[PDB]
């Protein structure tokens, strides 16, 4: 396997050719931002709850960026579900819903960003390339909207018009693309349970689990968007994610310090 062998195949064969795909798999692997952590702040689980949830998290982010480079992505929340319901009732396709949902995640990024502006932290574009905000000790963090850019080209789910790739997937793929060292989903439960704890009285906490074990238990579409689990098994750089409760003070800080709070979901 040499560069000449790969370049010949790249010229002479279709990109669909298994021989080309295999030669491509052998290429070197560059991590663009290997030292950053991607954090998702849930829209419904955090930002929609207002000051009592958001203000403590702002304080943690400000304290944490002294020792950690952070890419902070926003979820969407109840306003996106309202738009999805309106548009779905009209027969609009998933590609149109995806555009509508992005505007709500944008709103949340702007609200978070204004609480952090006096600390130097901006709302950005090309966060994974926004190299200048991340390289400063006075800054060391960016805020971005968590929706993927697929918009009208969103691939639909097998059933229904709800975009299957939303802000969990958007934040995860950014972490994966830039080769970040860590991916933390900040929600409103301690982590993954045997069942939805908002509905079940006796659900059991799961500290650590693989994607396959989650599927075997029917937890494929539980605390994370179910496509994120499949994305995680195909990932090159981010082979595990951590889910923590942002309503507990210090949870984010302790997750960044290597403490095993919440649930760790591994690719294998």
């Amino acid at each position: 396997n040499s560069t000449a062998e790969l370049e010949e195949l790249l010229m002479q064969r279709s990109l669909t050719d298994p021989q080309l795909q295999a030669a491509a798999a052998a290429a070197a692997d560059f991590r663009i931002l290997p030292d950053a952590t991607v954090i998702k702040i849930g829209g419904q689980s955090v930002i929609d709850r207002g000051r009592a949830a958001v203000y403590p998290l702002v304080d943690e982010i400000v304290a944490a960026r002294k020792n950690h480079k952070l890419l902070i992505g926003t979820g969407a929340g109840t306003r996106a579900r309202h738009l999805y319901s309106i548009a779905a009732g009209l027969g609009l396709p998933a590609g149109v819903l995806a555009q509508l949902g992005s505007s709500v995640a944008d709103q949340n990024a702007a609200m978070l960003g204004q609480l952090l502006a006096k600390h130097g932290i901006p709302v950005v574009g090309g966060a994974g390339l926004s190299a200048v905000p991340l390289s400063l000790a006075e800054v060391n963090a960016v805020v971005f909207s968590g929706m993927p850019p697929y918009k009208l080209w969103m691939r639909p789910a097998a059933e229904g018009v709800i975009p299957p790739y939303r802000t969990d997937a958007g934040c995860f793929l950014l972490a994966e693309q830039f080769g970040c060292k860590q991916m933390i989903f900040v929600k409103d439960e301690d982590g993954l349970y045997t069942a939805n704890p908002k509905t079940s009285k006796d659900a059991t906490f799961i500290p650590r689990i693989s994607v396959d074990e989650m599927k075997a238990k029917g937890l494929h579409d539980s605390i994370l968007e179910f496509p994120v689990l499949d994305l995680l098994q195909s990932a090159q750089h981010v082979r595990e994610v951590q889910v923590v409760n942002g309503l507990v003070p210090g949870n984010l800080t302790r997750a960044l310090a290597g403490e095993h709070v919440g649930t760790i979901i591994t690719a294998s």
Partner: protein, 245 residues
């Protein structure tokens, strides 16, 4: 119930990047055929990438870049092919339009003129799926996602070969390559080996809501695109597995 059709009168045409790679010898007869089609249909013409994306893949992989970096670098070449094609059609009122324009203002632009040209690559960008080091959501995939999302009347894929064979008709096993007049996406997806269309095209066909068939035709043979847009069988028909309401 399925989603409504946004532009039911639209016809989407995807031009393979490798057709453009052949230069004037291929492009001039294609431009002339497109010109005579303008009064007959309402056309969204989408260009693929071709050989220049292969070169930027070679450099990018040598530099170690991930699949989300290679995806917009290949899309760039599809866009340049689109500017080239549109320039040849400018005197008939045709221009290249950007992705945001295609996604939000296609209706008004097709009210102003008979056809527009755009890039067939979808804007997956740095959010391309991982797994392969080669971006999976390429020009065929992006064209179908758009055509099916719009509920368009059809998507026709215009290639430098007659259609789909049992092997690469330009590759090592060319001798055993047999032409496939018709196929299903699910049959193709179960096969192994190369294809003239993205494998991801087969996946989005499985979740499609409107487009029932996509025909792959040889754009190097004048008249095949014209016949395909009238539903005549002149290449390979791909059944998507959407079947009627």
């Amino acid at each position: 119930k399925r989603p409504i059709r946004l532009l039911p009168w639209l016809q989407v045409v995807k031009i393979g990047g490798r057709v453009m790679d052949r230069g004037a010898d291929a492009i001039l007869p294609l431009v002339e055929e497109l010109r005579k089609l303008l009064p007959e249909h309402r056309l969204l013409i989408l260009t693929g990438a071709g050989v220049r994306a292969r070169h930027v893949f070679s450099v990018g992989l040598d530099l170690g870049l991930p699949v989300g970096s290679l995806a917009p670098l290949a899309a760039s070449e599809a866009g340049q092919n689109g500017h080239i094609l549109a320039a040849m059609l400018a005197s008939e009122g045709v221009s290249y339009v950007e992705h945001p324009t295609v996604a939000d203002q296609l209706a008004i632009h097709l009210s102003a003129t008979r056809a527009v040209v755009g890039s067939a690559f979808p804007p997956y960008h740095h959010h391309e799926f991982p797994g392969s080091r080669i971006p999976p959501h390429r020009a065929d995939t992006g064209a179908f996602l758009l055509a099916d999302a719009f509920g368009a009347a059809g998507l026709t894929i215009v290639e430098n070969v007659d259609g789909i064979y049992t092997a690469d008709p330009n590759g090592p096993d060319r001798g055993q390559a047999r032409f496939l007049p018709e196929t299903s996406a699910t049959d193709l997806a179960k096969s192994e080996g190369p294809l003239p269309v993205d494998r991801a095209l087969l996946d989005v066909m499985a979740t499609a809501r409107h487009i029932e068939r996509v025909q792959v035709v040889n754009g190097l043979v004048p008249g095949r695109l014209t016949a395909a847009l009238r539903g005549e069988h002149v290449g390979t028909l791909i059944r998507t597995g959407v079947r009627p309401a």
